[PDB]
Amino acid sequence: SMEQVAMELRLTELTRLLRSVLDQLQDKDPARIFAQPVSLKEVPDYLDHIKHPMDFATMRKRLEAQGYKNLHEFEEDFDLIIDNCMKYNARDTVFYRAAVRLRDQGGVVLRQARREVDSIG
């Protein structure tokens, strides 16, 4: 149908906007602490601690499959990255501190993305 096509074009454009958002967020992680999944070879007990692991590579896979239907879903995954890290790692660690900086700096990027998604429909 023409409606299904139009909806597919909206999803495509959301995907384009979320791809730029993801690039901007990932630049706020220059140390690449959140780039890839925590290694279960190197942290074998991780899943006993963290029930829903997340990282930027895993978000990028979901994004490129047009697996984000709205900004709320994408934000949920970004928040898991931060929140997982702040639970697993202690306050006095490079890891925890990197999450706080990513959260603080990402907030700005996400505040305008919300307006761009409401604005462009």
Q: Fill in the DSSP letter of residue 39.
A: P
Q: What is the Cα gyration radius of the chain?
A: 16
Largest Cα–Cα separation, the chain: 56
57 within 8 A of 35, measured Cβ to Cβ: yes
Selection from 91, 29, 81, 90 nearest residue 52 by Cα: 81
36 within 8 A of 60, measured Cβ to Cβ: no
Q: What is the resolution of this structure in A?
A: 1.7
Tell me the CATH number of domain 1-121, given options 3.30.70.240, 3.40.50.880, 3.30.300.30, 1.20.920.10.
1.20.920.10
Elucidation technique: X-ray
